[PDB]
Each structure stands twice: as C-alpha cells, then as structure tokens.
Design a protein around this nucleic acid. Structure first.
Ligand SMILES: Nc1ncnc2c1ncn2[C@@H]1O[C@H](COP(=O)(O)OP(=O)(O)O)[C@@H](O)[C@H]1O
Ligand code: BEF
Ligand SMILES: [Mg+2]
Lengths: 93, 88, 98, 504, 107, 107, 93, 80, 95
DNA sequence: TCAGGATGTATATATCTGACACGTGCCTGGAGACTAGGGAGTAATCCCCTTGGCGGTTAAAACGCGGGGGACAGCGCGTACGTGCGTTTAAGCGGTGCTAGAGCTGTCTACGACCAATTGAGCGGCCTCGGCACCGGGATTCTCCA
DNA sequence: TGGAGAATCCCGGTGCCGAGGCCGCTCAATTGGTCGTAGACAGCTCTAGCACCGCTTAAACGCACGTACGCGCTGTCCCCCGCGTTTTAACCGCCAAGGGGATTACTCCCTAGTCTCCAGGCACGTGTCAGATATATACATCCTGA
C-alpha cells in the first residue's frame, strides 16, 4: 500500500539550505518523526485552546498562540514571523 | 526634614522574607539552614513564577481579555505538568 | 540563669508544627505585589482575580516545599544537616530544571 | 415592649396618618393588632446641675430630646456643627442623671481625634459622670473590661469607631440606655460592619447625632433612619419607592412635603447663620492656579502614556496625584541627596502661591490650618515646613492616642507660635474645635463635598473671634475642575431638599 | 483553469493541502480555518530548516557530505533552545555530547 | 413507555447520559458506542468511592465528621496506588504528610 | 447561567460509603476536579487508541484498554471488574 | 532463567564510561540490573497492552514507540 | 603499566565519541522475551521492536549514570555507589 | 625538571561496495467550481468587581548578641578497585527449513447518527442549626541542668 | 537518677456560619422511528519470525598485584540558633468610581459537502561514488627514572 511521509519536502528544504549535502536513510526517518511529533503537539494545543474558548474552529490565531506556548524564547518570534509572512502572502495572492 | 524620601526600598522580591522561607523549609522537613539559602530561594521562586505567569498571560491575551482568571492560571500549571486541584 | 533550649529543639518543634498545619506561609500582600510586578513585563495593565493570585500562591508554596525536601535529601547525602545552595542546585539539576 | 410600641404610636399616630399608610403599605405582624384599637378609638430654665450657661436653641433642643424620651421615640440632632451640640448632649445626660435620677449605662462613639474632646467637656461641665476613654491594646482594654466595665463602676464610656467592633462581646452583655453616635457618617452603608454590630446592641433609646445630614440619597437617608426605629420600618425598598425620590419622574417637587412634614418633628436641624452665637460669617476663595510648567511634561506623559513602564490601573488617582504634586510619582526628585530648597516650590504649582500666602498671613497673624488627602503629600509639606522652620504639629492617620491630644493642645495653647498645622482630611476634621486658628486652606478637592464643608468649619465654630478666610486650591485646566463640577452637582442634588426641610 | 498549489502561492515547500487534510482528519475541531494549514506548514518548514542547517554545519565540521543521526544529535544538543524543545526525546543512533567533569581530569 | 434512566439500568450512581454527552462533544472520536458511557461511569464511580472511603477513614481518625482537603491529602498520599496515580497533582490546602528524617532526630 | 458539576453524585457515593460523614465545600471542589481529570485522561487515551487502530468509534473495549493503561495494579483490576459488571447489567436489563 | 546475568559486567562498565563515570564501585552491578529490569517491565507491559488490544500476536516496533511515548520517553527513528 | 584512572579516561573519551549499542544483542533479546513471558504467553517480536527496546534502555541507563556521577561528586567522591543511584532515582521521582 | 622509551592516536593513501541520488510510469488525492447555512462578529446594555488610597490595630519581621555545635581541613591506614594476561566461551554471521500470522479484499448487517416529542432530574434560590474553632484553666508531659 | 520551668494536652462553654434540606422550573435526557455505513467475519497470500547447525573470533572471565581512595578520628573556628526588644508593614474596614465581562439580538461570509479532472507524489529500477576498510607514517603523551 501507499504510505506517505515528508521525505521529499525535507529534502527540498535541505537542498535550499545546504545545496550539496545529502542525508542518510536513518536520519531521514528521524526527521520524519520530528516533523510528525511537532505537528501533533501544535495541533493538540490549538484544539485545546479552541475548546477552552468554546469555539469550534481552529484558525491561524489559535495556531499562533499554540506556537507561542510550545516553542521556546527566541524560536517563537521567528516561527510566528514566518507564519505571518506565509499567511499574508497566501491571502494577497 | 528631608523625610519624604526615607523609604524607597521595597524591591518586591525582598517581600519574601527570611522567616517565610524558613517556615517553608521547616514544612519541608529541614533542620538547619545555611545563610545563603535565602537569595537562592528567591531566585528559584522568581524563575518559577515567571514561567507560570507567562503561560497564564498568553492564555488570557488569546481570549481577548484583560483579567487573568483562576482558570487561566490552572491551565498554565497543567501545561507545565503541575496539575492543581481545587480551583475549578 | 535564663532557661535556654539546646539548639535544634525549637527546630524540631517547628517542624512538627508546620507539618501538622496547612495554612499558607507567605504574606499575601508581598506575594501579590511580586506577582503583579512580574506580570508587568509581559502585558502592561493586566488585572488579576483574587482567586488567580491565590492559585499562584498555592502552587508556588507546594513547589518550594517539594524542592526543600529534595534539598534535604541531597544535604543528608553529603553527610551534612545544613542545606546549602549547592544542594538546591543539585536537586534542580537532577530534576531537569536548570 | 409592645406597651412601648403602643406608647410610640400614641405620638406617631398623633402625626399624620402617613404612619398608618406605611403600616398598611406593607406587603404583617401583630403591630396591626395594637394599631386597630387606637385607630377605632418643660424645663426651659437652663437647669443648674450643669456648670455654665445653656443657649436658647440649646435649651430648645434639650426640650425636644426630652419630648422624644417621654414619647419614647427617636430622632436625629441634625443641628449644624459647632452649635454647642456637645453641650446639648451633656445637659441632656444631666437631665437623665438628675430629673429622672437615673445615671445608668450609657454608650458614646466618637472619632479617634475626638475621643479626647467628649471627656474634656463632660469633665468641664458635669464632673459627676463616670466616663472612660476605652483605649489601649488588648491588655489595656483587658483590665478596663475586667475591673470597671465588668464591675459596673461607670456611667458612660467613650470609645472609637473600631474599638466597639473589637469589643462587641464584652459590650453586648451590658444592656444600655443610649448609644450616642457622633458624626454618624459610617452608618450611610447598611453592610458597614459598624452598622452590622449596632443592630446588635439593645439600649432603651438610640440617640443618633450628626454634623451634617445625609450625603447623597434617599438611600442614604433611610440607611441612617433604619437604626433609629427598626421595628417600625423594618423595610428596605418600601421606604424608597413609597416616596419616589423627590418625584424623580414627574418632578412635582410637592410630594417632598409629605416626607418633610414626617421628618420635621422627627428631626431637629438649626443653622449657624440664624442663631449666630458668634455674629461673624466666613469668607471663601477658590485660588484657581495654573498647573505647573515643569510637570506639564509629566502630565503629558500620563495623558499619552509616554514616566513609562509603570501601572496606571486607576487613571483617576494617577491624574489626581499629578494635579496634587509632581514628586509623588517616585522619581521627579532627581537629587541623589534630595535637595531641599526653592526648587521644590518652583516645581510645584500650588506652593508658590502658598508661600506668598504664608508670608502674608505670618505678618497678618492668621493662624492657619491645612487639609489634604495624601499622607505622603503631607510628608513633603513637613519637609517644606522644615525648610521654612515654622512651628506646627502634624496630626495624621495612625499617629497615636495621646500624641493627637498633645499636638492639639500645643497648637491651641495660648500664644502658640505654631504658625501652620498639618492635617489630613478624613482623619482630622471630624469634630475637633480649632477656634485658636482662623484661616483654613484646602490643598485638594474631595469627592465628598459635605466632608469638605465638615473640614472648613473646624475653626468656624463658637469661640471664633476672627473672620474665617477660606482658600481652596483648584488647579486650572485640570481634572480637578471636573472634580469641582461634580462636587457642585452633588451639593445641589441634596441642599435644595435640605433647604426645603426647614421651610416646609 | 490551470491549478497553482497552495504551497506555491504561499511561498512554502511543505504541502499545505496535506496539512489541511491531516488537520481535518485528526479530530482536532469541528471546523478548520483557511489560514491554519498555511500557518502550520510555514512553522514546520522553519523548524525543519533550522535543524537542517545546524546538522549540515556539524557534518561539514566532521568532513562528511551526508547527514547522520550523530549530526542531528550534535546540532540539537548544542543549540540550547532546540535542546529545551526536544528535552524528552531520544534520537536513535545518536550518542552523547563529549563531556567530562573537571574534578575527574588529572591535575 | 415509561422513562427509566440508563444509570438506573446499569445500577450506577453517576450520570450515564451526562458522560455520554461529554464524550460526544469532546471530539474524541467520530462516533461513540453504546457501552462506552456505561463503562466510563462505572470506572469513575469506583475511583470516587475508593478515595471517599479512605478519606472518611482519615477524617474519623481525627475524631472529625466532615471531610476536608487535609483528609483527602492524607488518604491519597497514604495509599500507594492513589499516590502513584495522583503523582503530579497538587491538592490545594492539603498540606504535607508528617515526616522527619532519620538522622535529624535526637539520638 | 447554569453551571454543571458532580456534586450530587459524589454526595450519593459518599452516603453509600460513610452513611453519616459530611463533606466540606473545598473538599467537594477537589473531588469535582479529580473526577474531571480522570475523565479526561481516560477519554484521551481511548481516543488515541482508536486513532492508532484506524477506527472511528470509541467502544467499551477501548475504554477497558485505556483503564488498563492508566490505572495501577489493583485499581486497574477492580475498575475493569466494575466496568464489565455495569456493562453486563446494562445489556441484560 | 538467569538471563539478567546476560547483561554482563563489561557492558555495564561501557555504559558507565559513556555516561562519564571514571571509577565504579562493585555493588553497582546488581543495582543496575534491578533498575534495568524494572524499566523493561514497565515498557513491555504497556507495549503488550497495545498489542493485545490490537488483537495481534506480534509486538511491533510501533507498540514499543507508543509505550515509550506514554511513559514520557519519546523515541525518534523507528517509524513515525 | 598505566596508573589507575588512565585507561578509564581513555575509555570515557572513546565511548563518548562512539555511537553504536553497548549491550550484546542476543543476551538483551533473551532478557526481553523472558520478561514479556510474564504478561502474555507466546508473544512474538519484530526485530525492530527489540532494537527499539534496546535503544531506549541504553539511553535511559546512560542518563541515569550521568545523574549518579553528579551525586557521587556531590558527596566528595569519584566512586559511584548504590546509594548514589538510589538518590538520583528518588530525586527524579521514579521511586 | 627533564629525557627517553613506549604506547595509543591521528593523518595519509589505495580499493571495494551497497546505499543513495536520479529517472520512468501511473494513479489517486488535491485544486477549481458552486451552494447552503450556521458559527462568528458587532452593537447596545448592565451590573458586578477590581483598584487605590487611607485609618487604625497589632502581629510579625528586623536587629543584636552570646555560644555551641557542626562544617571543614588534615592525617593515617587498609582494602577494594583498576590494569594486565592467558583461557574459555558464546556472540555474530551464514545458511537451510517451515509455518504462524500479518495484511488485504469482499459482503452485509447491525449499530450509531439524527430528528421530533415529551417529561422529570438537576440547578439556582431560600432558610436553619449543629459541627467546629477558640478560650481559659488545670492537669500532664517534656526538656534541661543538678 | 534530678526538681523546675515551659510546652502540650483535657475538658467544658460559646458563638457562628456554612452544610444540608425544601422548592419551582427548564432544559437536557429518554423514547421511538428511519437510514446509511463501519466493522465483524470469512477467506486468501506470502512475509517475516522462530529454530537449529557450523565456524570464526572477539569478548568475557578468572586470577594476580599494587596503590589510590574511602572512611574514621581529631581539632578548630565561624556561623547559625535561641531569645529579648524595637519597628514596620500586613490586614481588614471603608469609600468611591469606572470598566470589563456577560447577555441578547441580528447578520453575513466562510467552511463543509459534492463533483470533475489531471499532475504531483510514490513505488520501482539503476548506476556510481561516499564511506568503510585496510595499511603505513607522524606525532602526541604518559611514565619511570635521572
Ligand atoms: N453655651 C455655651 N457657653 C460657652 N461656650 C460654648 C457654649 N456653646 C458652645 N461653646 C463653645 O463652643 C465650642 C463648641 O464645641 P462643641 O459643643 O463640641 O461643638 P460641637 O459639639 O458641635 O462640636 C466649645 O469648645 C465650647 O467651649
Ligand atoms: F461641631 Be462638631 F465638632 F463637628
Ligand atoms: Mg455640640
């Protein structure tokens, strides 16, 4: 059966960052696990926020708040900046 | 004269007095206490409170409020893995 | 001659007293001022509930009592009876809070 | 009890049938049982047991009070302050002591600065009365309760506002004759613990006294009134909606006569102007001064939130501090040694005109009094008095029991060089007499204008041999102007009906 | 017309559509907004890029051209914020940071 | 017919209907079986009765007749299963178990 | 505004266990918090079980497994016994 | 059957060296064997609970990963 | 001969530089099967399942040994001891 | 203090190989388009609740000081732990053999969602007295120095 | 091997305030239908897990030997505890005054559901080169003796 992951996207990001560096299979699996784990943490926190405020819709504002709760210190500012930039560009075009 | 400026020295963290810290240690079961424990304890408490209050304020500000509520504090604690019973 | 107790007797008596009781051990106004001052660095002009401040104080005191128990264990481990900042730091370091 | 109820109705029903209407507007215990049967069917000589002379209106007030006593009905001595109402009370207690030959248990309540005055005057006039100032810590109150209060070795006892709250249980055991309540301003609230504990004591009579009548509302009015005759009213919103608040909707202004005629024999209020007793009025000036140029910058910093990184949770109080004085905000005084010089007066708006006025009145011989809300502002004034090296005495909230007395005496000592006298507002000006002083100045405005009037008339009483020159300070183009406007609003919301009370 | 993927029009590399699907099929809420997947994908891309550049630097310092779990471990544990984030995480075939206490070293 | 509550049918005291509603609106899965609320209510009742019994014994052990947070704390921290369960829980106004270390006491 | 809790049910259980003992108000608040917490723990564990096995229904089998995963030792055994007893009675009656 | 003794002395010394222990006592070995047995017992019991719930008869790597995650030790690299 | 404490430091550097496992595969596997024998009979393990157990166990023990070392230093020693292990686990709350 | 021997470790270079980077082919899941309706947003109103100051009491913190006992440093000794070496033992790798059981597909039915009507269990409001927390005296027990 | 002083417990009386019982109503829980799909169950395939054997060799093991370190003991001195006395700020009542959080009503636009279609992503080959592996030289570093 067809099983999916984030391998191709992680590889594209790698070729954007270090243009001539490869990555082994075990490391690739590790980073797949990392992306899944972070995704699930953020989504769970956003879900709990939305239920907390008796709303029934996860929006970019709940995602932003969950990011600010989970990520530590200087990481949070850059993360929210990247998210805001992406959403702004998406809506503008 | 020159008495209106004789008391400007609160420094709120000093509000956690030496006897209070000693009482806390006694409840913890400590028989004898060094003299440097007080400043160290004040630092530890300040860090703990900063973390909890940051989380509670984030929850509150997300909810478009201006009043930190007992529920917000409870959820901050629970998010830090310190569940608290008795405040709803 | 005045009647003085041997050092440690009053310490043990206080230990029994405070492990028997349950009231809060920090003065409420100083604690509330501290909480408000700390909050001032995150969002200006907040407004706490009394129950919120009480919850903060409950949690803080429970945390400090547990930390002092661990500190006592470390101090005993070093064959002392006097708790020291290095004992506190070891307790927090093992807990994973440093 | 019920016989007393019938006796009371003998005189209450002797007034209009409005008491019947109130009984019949209840939405009812057996008071109707004694009502139905009735429905279907002196000493004007200034008696000499006092040591002095009684004024004519004083004798009239004593007669009104003894009429209330014979009717076994209550009332309120709403006579304007400084009309010898202490003398009226002392002569009335002498009446109960001698004419009925009943000196028994009596209870009087006064503010802390004023516990001295009652004992001094009772000693000056009727030294035959056993009176205490029940002061001291737990133990000083302990032997006082144990020895004399338990020993029943007294006639009257003089206490403060809070001490009765502290000693309710050793005082409930003593059934009283009178619960004398000076300056009955704490009663305006029903949930006030003083009211909560004064519905508990059982005296044969309950003589409420005041310096000024109600402050804001018919609500306030019945809040005071309920503790006079409670078994008669025992009702909360009936009294309000029955009168409809000065015809709040139709503005008839004629139904006020019902209330006013009910209270006219049920209250006794006189004015200083009618019966002078001093033959000299008081002047009043509002020294509108500009808000200081230097603190203009910080006032902008407060308006636009520009110094920074500080709390502003009560913009009212913050702006009010700024309007009072700049240096209260913890840092306007840059000097690491905290210089004490003409820079203070230069930087504070009011103090320049104040220094001019002080230089004037020192030469003019005016003996001045100053009132304020901020004890810290009084600290700054104390430092500035040190700068000018004037003699004075500083009474503030929480000074002492004895030190209040000794400072008052030092100021009121004959030929006292104490030119100024620093005082707070809500702790200082509630009944003391300072006729040795003549001029009273307010540093700030208070959201209780009736309290302000209470304040200015400290020196404007019987014994004032000079013209009272009032100089209120109001800052121009400041929120204190709106303070004054709302103050005038609340003055007129009450004083029109107060003036209608006397006429009809 | 001709489609243009949401990832492309947001300027990302991670799949916005896949994140949208996972959010909907994950029972996180009754409804899912339209900017939630774009935001979340951008954040995930940022974190991935961060770890990747640190691991690439480590591998280059080790004179290798491929990234391995050892390099991921070194990057994560040498960056203090990432270490705080992944505090309760074990990386398979990771190892430990080289570290000896001072008192043990000879004098 | 005649209404008879599911809690009564199961022979419980806790509200099966309320628990079923809470499982429904909690977004835990897409569907909720019919025996899940009954099972969950039975479990919650068992745990509640267990702690209440222990705390009642603790309260009677101090010659009291009303249970207070100190009594709850004593029961929980003295029973080892419940101590393991509520290991991360702070009970407000609960206090601490009396315990002085072996070497601190006078010899 | 209505606010629902577990007061009456905790009280009925108390009267079954200790027929004459009372209970204060703060203790009742604590018991309410305890019941809510245990509910949430069990329900979340059952949710993730169902997701792991690619099911879309929370059944008594999921609840039983979640109890067995959360409660320690004798608590797990007796809780399983009680839940099974209740479900059997519910179906048979 | 004395399988815990299969965790030999040199293996424990290697683990200690990686942890940074310069000098090791002699009683450490039984203590560490007991610690390891307790840890394994907890993790395997949770893993077998997941396996038995799935109505399988083979313990998969995902069951171990889930059990570790439940106890709080997330493990990256063995699938998802 | 090397003085005591030299080969030990050399081994410290070597094993902190390395990455592989440190316990023998088959002994660990037999241990795992024996332990699981007490919960359900006749299980069956995936090789990756057993490898995951080994990775987790070794990581756990290494971290525990770091904490034990800290306690030993705290008592002014260089020799870890059973009571050091017990103190570390008690502080972490595994007791 | 240093010298020289000895041992382990890094640095350099030549050779395999199997793990990764890349190309093909296909199919399924994401994008485009369109509709309905309900959740979220906005306005207006109200009333409780948070804040800041003071007033006055009084309990707790602050402060000073003698002294004793515990932290700490040094010293000796004796044994337990590290280092090395030869012998044994079992791990690791390979190979062959077999089958349980994991994983998938197909059918169909029974169970859960949803809706509408009904009713009664639980919630807020209201009253009342008994459990509990002092408060004082007296009695007992503990600690400490003889 | 002791009484004397302080702490603590015993017992009864008192005031209070919150736990517990009653009551109206409303909204959530139950009862009864219809309908659609999740999953229970059968049957098939073929992967991957279990079992055993043979051979190599690297690690584990048992023992010898020596010294470094743990631990006990002693003395010293400094710093914490105990207690008495003075000062300070905590604590509760009180007074205003706004503001912010909840409620209520209405509206609209943003998301789910449905359908169509095609290209992005996944499974499957394939070559090849980065790393693993094996040797050889260089150098650092430890250790005993001078
Ligand atoms: N009839 C009188 N004869 C002499 N002096 C009087 C008389 N009435 C009042 N005074 C003086 O006027 C002052 C008013 O004091 P007091 O009676 O206390 O006024 P109040 O009771 O209104 O405060 C007193 O100090 C008293 O000496
Ligand atoms: F006239 Be009284 F002293 F207020
Ligand atoms: Mg008078």
């Amino acid at each position: 059966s067809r099983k999916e992951s984030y391998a191709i996207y992680v590889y594209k990001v790698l070729k954007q960052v270090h243009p001539d560096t490869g990555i082994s299979s075990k490391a690739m699996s590790i980073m797949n696990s990392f992306v899944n784990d972070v995704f699930e943490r953020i989504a769970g926190e956003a879900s709990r926020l939305a239920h907390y405020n008796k709303r029934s819709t996860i929006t970019s504002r709940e995602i932003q708040t969950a990011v600010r709760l989970l990520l530590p210190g200087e990481l949070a500012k850059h993360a929210v900046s990247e998210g805001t930039k992406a959403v702004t560009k998406y809506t503008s075009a | 004269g020159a008495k209106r400026h004789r008391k400007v020295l609160r420094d709120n963290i000093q509000g956690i007095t030496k006897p209070a810290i000693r009482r806390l240690a006694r409840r913890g079961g400590v028989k004898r206490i060094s003299g440097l424990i007080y400043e160290e304890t004040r630092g530890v408490l300040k860090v703990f409170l900063e973390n909890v209050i940051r989380d509670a304020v984030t929850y509150t500000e997300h909810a478009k409020r201006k009043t930190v509520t007992a529920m917000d504090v409870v959820y901050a604690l629970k998010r830090q893995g310190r569940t608290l019973y008795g405040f709803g | 001659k005045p009647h003085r107790y041997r050092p440690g007797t009053v310490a043990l008596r206080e230990i029994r007293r405070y492990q028997k009781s349950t009231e809060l051990l920090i003065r409420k106004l100083p604690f509330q001022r501290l909480v408000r001052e700390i909050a001032q660095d995150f969002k200006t002009d907040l407004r706490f509930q009394s129950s919120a401040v009480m919850a903060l104080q409950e949690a803080s005191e429970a945390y400090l009592v547990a930390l002092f128990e661990d500190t006592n264990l470390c101090a005993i481990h070093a064959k002392r009876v006097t708790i020291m900042p290095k004992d506190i730091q070891l307790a927090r370091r093992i807990r994973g809070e440093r | 009890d019920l016989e007393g109820t019938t006796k009371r109705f003998e005189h209450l029903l002797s007034l209009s049938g409005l008491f019947k209407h109130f009984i019949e507007s209840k939405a009812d215990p057996k008071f109707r049982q004694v009502l139905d049967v009735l429905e279907e069917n002196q000493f004007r000589e200034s008696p000499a047991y006092v040591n002095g002379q009684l004024r004519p209106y004083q004798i009239q007030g004593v007669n009104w009070l003894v009429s209330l006593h014979k009717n076994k009905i209550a009332g309120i001595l709403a006579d304007e302050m400084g009309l010898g109402k202490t003398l009226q009370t002392i002569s009335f207690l002498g009446y109960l002591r001698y004419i009925e030959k009943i000196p028994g248990p009596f209870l009087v309540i006064a503010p802390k600065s004023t516990l001295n005055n009652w004992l001094r005057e009772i000693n000056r006039w009727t030294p035959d009365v056993n009176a205490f100032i029940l002061q001291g810590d737990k133990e000083e109150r302990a032997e006082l309760i144990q020895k004399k209060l338990l020993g029943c070795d007294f006639d009257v006892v003089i206490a403060s506002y809070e001490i009765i709250i502290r000693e309710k249980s050793p005082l409930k055991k003593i059934n009283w004759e009178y619960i004398i309540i000076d300056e009955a301003h704490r009663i305006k609230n029903e949930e006030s613990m003083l009211s909560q504990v004064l519905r508990e004591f059982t005296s044969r009579n309950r003589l409420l006294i005041t310096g000024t009548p109600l402050q804001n509302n018919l609500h306030e009015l019945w809040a005071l009134l309920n503790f006079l005759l409670p078994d008669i009213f025992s009702d909360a919103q009936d009294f309000d909606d029955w009168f409809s608040s000065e015809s709040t909707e139709e503005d008839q202004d004629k139904i006020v006569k019902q209330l006013h005629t009910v209270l006219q024999p049920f209250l006794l209020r006189r004015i200083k102007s009618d019966v002078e007793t001093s033959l000299l009025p008081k002047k009043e000036l509002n020294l509108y001064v500009g808000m200081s140029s230097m603190q203009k910058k910080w006032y902008k910093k407060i308006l636009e939130k520009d110094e920074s990184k500080t709390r502003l949770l009560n913009i009212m109080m913050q702006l009010r501090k700024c309007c009072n004085h700049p240096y209260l905000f913890d840092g306007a005084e840059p000097g690491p040694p905290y210089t004490t010089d003409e820079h203070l007066v230069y930087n504070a708006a009011k103090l320049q005109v104040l220094d001019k006025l002080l230089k004037k009145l020192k030469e003019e011989g005016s003996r001045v009094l100053i009132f304020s809300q901020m004890s810290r502002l009084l600290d700054i004034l104390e430092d500035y008095c040190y700068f000018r090296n004037y003699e004075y005495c500083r009474i503030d909230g929480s000074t002492a029991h004895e030190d209040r007395i000794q400072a008052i005496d030092d100021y009121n000592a004959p030929d006292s060089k104490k030119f100024v006298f620093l005082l707070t507002t809500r702790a200082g000006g509630l009944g003391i007499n300072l006729t040795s002083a003549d001029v009273v100045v307010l540093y700030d405005s208070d959201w209780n204008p009736q309290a302000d009037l209470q304040a200015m008339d400290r020196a404007h009483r019987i014994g004032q041999k000079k013209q009272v020159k009032v100089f209120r300070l109001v800052t121009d183009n400041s929120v204190e102007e709106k303070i004054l406007e709302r103050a005038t609003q609340k003055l007129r919301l009450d004083q029109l009906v107060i003036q209608q009370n006397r006429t009809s | 017309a001709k489609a243009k993927t949401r990832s492309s029009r947001a300027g990302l590399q991670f799949p916005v559509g896949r994140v949208h699907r996972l959010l909907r099929k994950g029972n996180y809420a009754e409804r899912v907004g339209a900017g939630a997947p774009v935001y979340l994908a951008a954040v995930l891309e940022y974190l991935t890029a961060e770890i990747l550049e640190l691991a690439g630097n480590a591998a280059r310092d080790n004179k290798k051209t491929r990234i391995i779990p050892r390099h991921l471990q070194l990057a994560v544990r040498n960056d203090e914020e990432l270490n705080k984030l992944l505090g309760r995480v074990t990386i398979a075939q990771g190892g430990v940071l080289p570290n000896i206490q001072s008192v043990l070293l000879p004098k």
